[PDB]
Amino acid sequence: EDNELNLPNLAAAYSSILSSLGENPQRQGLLKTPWRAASAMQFFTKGYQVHDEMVIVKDIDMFSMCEHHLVPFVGKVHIGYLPNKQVLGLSKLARIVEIYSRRLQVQERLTKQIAVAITEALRPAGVGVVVEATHMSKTVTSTMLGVFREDPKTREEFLTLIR
Amino acid sequence: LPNLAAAYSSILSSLGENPQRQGLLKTPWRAASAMQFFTKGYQETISDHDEMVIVKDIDMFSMCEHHLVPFVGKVHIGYLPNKQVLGLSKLARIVEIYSRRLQVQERLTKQIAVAITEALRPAGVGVVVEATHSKTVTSTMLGVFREDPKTREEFLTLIR
Amino acid sequence: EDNELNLPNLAAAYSSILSSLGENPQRQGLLKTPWRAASAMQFFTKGYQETISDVHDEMVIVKDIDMFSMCEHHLVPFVGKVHIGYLPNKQVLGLSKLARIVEIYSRRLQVQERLTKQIAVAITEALRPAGVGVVVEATSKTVTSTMLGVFREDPKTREEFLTLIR
Amino acid sequence: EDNELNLPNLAAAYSSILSSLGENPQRQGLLKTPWRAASAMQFFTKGYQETISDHDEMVIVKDIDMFSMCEHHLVPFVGKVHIGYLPNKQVLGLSKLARIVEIYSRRLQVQERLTKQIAVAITEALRPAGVGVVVEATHMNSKTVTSTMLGVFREDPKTREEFLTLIR
Amino acid sequence: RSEEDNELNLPNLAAAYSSILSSLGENPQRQGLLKTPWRAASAMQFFTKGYQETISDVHDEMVIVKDIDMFSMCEHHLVPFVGKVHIGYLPNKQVLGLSKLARIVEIYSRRLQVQERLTKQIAVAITEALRPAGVGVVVEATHSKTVTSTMLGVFREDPKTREEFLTLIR
Amino acid sequence: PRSEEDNELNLPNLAAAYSSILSSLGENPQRQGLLKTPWRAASAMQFFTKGYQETISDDEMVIVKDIDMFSMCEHHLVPFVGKVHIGYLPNKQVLGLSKLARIVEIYSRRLQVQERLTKQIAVAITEALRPAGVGVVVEATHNSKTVTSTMLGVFREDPKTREEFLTLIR
Amino acid sequence: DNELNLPNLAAAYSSILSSLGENPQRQGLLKTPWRAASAMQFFTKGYQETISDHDEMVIVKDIDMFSMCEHHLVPFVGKVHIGYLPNKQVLGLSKLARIVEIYSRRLQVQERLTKQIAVAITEALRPAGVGVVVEATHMCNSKTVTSTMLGVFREDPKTREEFLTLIR
Amino acid sequence: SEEDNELNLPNLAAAYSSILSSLGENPQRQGLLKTPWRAASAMQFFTKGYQETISDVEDHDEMVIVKDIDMFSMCEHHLVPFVGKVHIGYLPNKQVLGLSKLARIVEIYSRRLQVQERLTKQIAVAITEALRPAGVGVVVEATHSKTVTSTMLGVFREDPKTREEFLTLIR
Amino acid sequence: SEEDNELNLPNLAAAYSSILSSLGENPQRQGLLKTPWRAASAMQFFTKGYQETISDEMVIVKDIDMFSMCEHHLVPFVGKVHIGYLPNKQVLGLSKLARIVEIYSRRLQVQERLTKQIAVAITEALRPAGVGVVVEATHNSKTVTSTMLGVFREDPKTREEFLTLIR
Amino acid sequence: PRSEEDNELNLPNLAAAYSSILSSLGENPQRQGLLKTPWRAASAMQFFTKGYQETISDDHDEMVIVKDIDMFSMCEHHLVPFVGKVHIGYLPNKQVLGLSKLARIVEIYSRRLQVQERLTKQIAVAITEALRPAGVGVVVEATHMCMVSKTVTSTMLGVFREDPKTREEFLTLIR
Ligand SMILES: NC1=NC(=O)C2=NC(=O)SC2=N1
Ligand SMILES: NC1=NC(=O)C2=NC(=O)SC2=N1
Ligand SMILES: NC1=NC(=O)C2=NC(=O)SC2=N1
Ligand SMILES: NC1=NC(=O)C2=NC(=O)SC2=N1
Ligand SMILES: NC1=NC(=O)C2=NC(=O)SC2=N1
Ligand SMILES: NC1=NC(=O)C2=NC(=O)SC2=N1
Ligand SMILES: NC1=NC(=O)C2=NC(=O)SC2=N1
Ligand SMILES: NC1=NC(=O)C2=NC(=O)SC2=N1
Ligand SMILES: NC1=NC(=O)C2=NC(=O)SC2=N1
Ligand SMILES: NC1=NC(=O)C2=NC(=O)SC2=N1
Ligand SMILES: [Zn+2]
Ligand SMILES: [Zn+2]
């Protein structure tokens, strides 16, 4: 309901942007652009709308938005954890990436959020979150909690297996 | 086999597809035979040197027990023997018995490591399963593989 | 659409499969499996629900299009990549729409050879271009390649398409 | 002058976008965002501010980093450009080939159009024996490759094979 | 060749393999060699299983099946040679099931072979079965690699077709 | 230990067993390409087991990596080929780098089990040089690879030494 | 300052062309004294700037670096990899690159240049640890790698292993 | 000549000392005291190819290639070095060139104030004039985004088989 | 012949001992005592080819390890040979193709001559429709010499195929 | 130390031995191409052993590495050249060495009749004696013509031997 009500307001602002750039919004290729740009921005912010072995999900494709300039940034996320008593469904790990990445973000915050989500949900022995992105030269942010921070064997294993 | 083929014929009809098509006439039997091969590990029981022994890149083919969709990957096994050494052909047979079942990657990894441990009673074991159901890597480190940093670093490096 | 009416009939057949495999369908991890397996099979054949419907002097290529299809012989999925190229005559297709053509035909009970012919004909009929090139590589790998018009007849064109998809 | 006058109008529209997303525009990290976004959008469309105004060998400039804007959704698309030409009587300074890429890429584009524009700009500037322009970009994990072959690059099989091999 | 012939000849192969172990200045009664004459006999039977099968039992686009794992035996020294087979064809009116394509390779490769002959044998099988416009067979093996290549019909005569085959197999 | 007189005397006995194998496989031993095969196979088997004819008697990490290894599976008499990576920290005696490869050759040219081969190379070095530590890695293909690793002395006990060996051999 | 700095540089570059044995009035050499002076100004622009302008490891790798050899005035080019574990202050990722640019755009020595980047970060953020890796190919086939590890990056084996692995 | 270099060395060092003073730095610094002389000597080494003459430096029927020849030239526009690789190929007619001498050809033209296009052409012409071959191929790839310049003469230009072969063998 | 090699071996070791002395080096050092005989054996092995004599599908043997000697300075050069042939009515055993390479490689060579010799040996032995010989050696810069005879020179399809398959 | 007078005097004695080698190989020394070979071989052998003519005599807080140094030496067992790469690393105490001079140390010791184990040791000792650093790491990876297989010799001194963090870092950064 919030998206359907805000969609016109976004398209109105996108039409204003086209006009403010010294461009004609009534052009053939630019007629549908305010609506399309609004729909795209809605998709990039849809997140605002859930054993005794190391479990890793590497190369998770991640699409987020720079909260400073409103320019997207793509990347990859590699999550790892050592369960205590609760295990998370591998599809749900990707949903955690998606909820936080589809938002006006900062890579450092986005990493911290994915690690905290896992920690709070499973209460595991250790968690490892690596985000490697190219912002529109790479930026790598890494969160190591529990046994992932304290155990050299555990951290070396996580870092090696995600390569 | 005829009960599986009957269910596969029902699936073809339920999908808005003509089961009497040229290419779909033998499909209920072929699909039933394929599903039997993907679950052949149920027909088998596990009952059938002072150095690190590794067998890497073991091709694994398994079936997700949630959606009945195959998942394919590779298994890397390593162990430090105590008094019993396993024939390298038999390590692959353990992977085949558990992978040809309706599996969950985590359980499959747990099973292959326990099978080795119970069979050889080794100083340590290391089982790594990397599969594509974005990749999922599950790793079991038992004994000296868990406790010795030198041993674990060596297994992980040699499987690359 | 009709997938709402056939969903319980597909779930029933999947439960029969679980029982026929010497497995307990009332297991913790196998309880909602007849529903999940039925929903998965409907997603792998969603291309049947869509129609062919849709809406420059240079070679246009879209390579590494992820393809997921289902072998019509054994009902086992086959996965690959599609590489499409064309030289327009007067009509150009939106690059997003090229991928939607791949999706319509790949989400069905297919044979790789038929699939690639299906995409090739869809583009030809839609744009009426000077040439078309469709390469499907799926999994030992199987590569099927359709070269039409200037892509078949011009050696320079075909070499260019094949080089640019690498 | 046009940019300085339109900058507050762009920032006003960007502040409206922040509010329309269910986000607090008075947040610490979002206070300067309408101005920063407006300045960024101005840089992505700076091409509009600019105007396009003996040898016997193939000249190539490959892996030219390209940053452009999808005219359809206003989402950036990034790739690389490979340019080649066989001169007739006029040769272009290798720095200037990249400036042609920049003028056309810093606009609301369609990959096909941008590719054609670079090739026509070179053809009109040098009047060469042939031009080759390959643009590969990532806008679903797949790449889009557009290719313009003019003159001897289109007609000579030896020339086209050589260009395509040397850009690899 | 039949399964009855194999079961009857298996003890005669194991007897010859035990004689080989003894002739090498090796103790056939040591732990690791107690089952070796029979394992060697069974292995040799598997490397020559293609003799048990017959070729009889087994669209306007190029159809290629690349990276087909091949395991064969050198008929000169009885030492295995391993490689990869790349097959391609342009159909006329008959198309072969892609599973059956690699089954042609398993028939000729599981015999006492010479790479050149095995390559020719594969290409002729496809040509005789389908009667296609063109065929292409490439065998690359390590007995320094040995590559044998057969190009028939449109694959030999059309430069565009051969270039396409050779590029797509890479 | 085996000698050249033993080989010349056992050669017809090996060829006789190889002729029996050809006949037992449902194959014509009088074929053009199979006439000399019993002798060629016997000569090849003698070369694969030539290590039986030889005896081992005749302040920095030192590594010799990518040593080509060719051995014979003692279970089925089928060759297995791989690579050996050797490393050692000398105490007072250094071995000529050519001689490290000769140790590989003596043990690999025999009916082997990969684990045994690795142990033998490591023990031969240890006994010859009496070094601070030894490292022997054998990676072989008998699509799946088998890696065996022996770490003795400072290579087993020092984490710095083992990490260094393992990294330098890549 | 830079207005009255560039003419003196172009004058010296014209003198160099004449001293080499070249004709500075040649077609391709007419603009060369100014272009060379503008290039040398760009390689030393870091003199014009001052440095005054979460619980996780933060890395920025593959930063392109262009510097001047202070011994022979020959450019040296490479990459910088930066990492840090914050205490209470985090630096904007754009600003890390500006520190690289400030010190690299000077008459440098790779060792000094590396040390300067690390000290600038340490003094600005006061972090738990810092890691700086500079790889470069000088014109003085062989590569020069310089590495500074401060705080927890020097003392913690887990921390250093991780930064060195993540920069690959 | 060597006399010209010795006489112009203090004039180059004087201009380099002026450059140090014009960048915003102290020329009397410990590490910058010898810099005007070192920079002058470096610039002399980058232009040593002006001191050499091509003159200063048999029937086969096969393509002869020398690939991955390290090249270090100086851009004549900004006096900034450009570095790359040269790939040379030729089909001899009656004379063959010593493989060491092909690298000396690269050195004489690359150690000058160049434009990559001119540098490629000079090497190709030097080979053509020296051997009088059936064909010549010169592919220079440098980083001043890479710049590739290619000269195809004789049978290398006219024969499609010859050009495809040279281009494939240099990979 | 093998008799000539065994008889010339002490004359080579004598010359190698003289070389050690002429270099301002102690020929009586621990590591240099066996060097004149080892250097002699090595040079003999490098020129081993002198004692030997030259006695419907594309056939290729690629990545043949080649070890030769530069006839100008007596310094070894090492590379790889790729051979291809299209037979007329005569086929050569793949083991024998490598023996031809060994014959000519193991001499005081010039890469250009060595490529011509391998190609001529195949041509004369089989009388094929075409021959292709590629030698790539390092005497950071590599030297590639290529001989294309018959159908390999004349047919563009044949040459493209040979060049592609040797990669 | 060897000198230019020693080289000029020994050149005809080297060429005489090289002419004897040509004759002993069943080859015609008077061939058009082999006429200058005894002199050229003697001159080449003099260049491969030019390091005998030279003598070694002629605060930073960071690891300094120079990797991929092209090395060209001569196996003292068979007089066959061996070619490889040298990777040098050091942690300075108070003195830093000019990066050009690190390569000159490689050249002085590689241009001699060597054994890789010795050459590695010699470069490490030369650096240690010159700078007196906290640690030194020298890796040589070469391919010998004693057939094919690579030989890697590694010297770790000071903090490079004793500190696991230092050794892991050097080994990772030379890759
Ligand atoms: N694979 C694995 N890695 C660990 O680090 C670990 N720590 C544990 O306690 S159990 C375990 N398994
Ligand atoms: N290679 C090797 N790796 C180990 O980790 C080990 N542990 C032991 O007890 S014996 C041994 N050998
Ligand atoms: N890039 C390009 N390649 C062709 O093959 C072609 N043929 C044409 O007619 S227009 C064109 N452009
Ligand atoms: N490299 C090169 N390739 C060509 O195709 C060409 N054609 C010409 O006329 S000049 C030339 N140079
Ligand atoms: N892809 C393709 N390649 C050919 O070479 C060809 N020849 C034909 O007749 S139909 C065809 N399709
Ligand atoms: N490279 C090297 N690695 C070691 O581990 C070692 N230990 C020692 O005592 S001397 C030495 N050198
Ligand atoms: N990724 C990560 N690496 C560290 O070494 C570390 N040390 C800490 O205290 S918090 C932390 N995160
Ligand atoms: N390798 C080679 N390639 C050619 O194109 C050629 N043309 C000739 O006339 S002789 C020759 N050798
Ligand atoms: N594979 C193959 N390639 C050729 O080029 C050829 N030419 C011929 O005459 S027969 C043949 N087979
Ligand atoms: N990069 C670097 N690595 C070390 O291990 C080290 N140890 C020190 O004492 S100073 C230093 N710098
Ligand atoms: Zn898009
Ligand atoms: Zn310049």
Numbering used by the authors:
A (entry chain G): 62 to 110, 116, 126 to 211, 223 to 249
B (entry chain I): 68 to 115, 126 to 210, 223 to 249
C (entry chain J): 62 to 116, 126 to 209, 223 to 249
D (entry chain F): 62 to 114, 125 to 210, 221 to 249
E (entry chain H): 59 to 116, 126 to 210, 223 to 249
F (entry chain C): 58 to 115, 127 to 210, 222 to 249
G (entry chain E): 63 to 115, 126 to 212, 222 to 249
H (entry chain B): 60 to 116, 124 to 210, 223 to 249
From the paper:
Guanosine triphosphate (GTP) cyclohydrolase I (GCH1) (EC:3.5.4.16) catalyzes the conversion of GTP to dihydroneopterin triphosphate (H2NTP). This reaction is the first and rate-limiting step involved in the de novo synthesis of tetrahydrobiopterin (BH4). The effects of GFRP on GCH1 occur via formation of heteromeric protein complexes between GCH1 and GFRP, which are dependent on the intracellular concentrations of the effector molecules phenylalanine or BH4. GCH1−GFRP complexes consist of one GCH1 decamer flanked by two pentameric GFRP complexes.
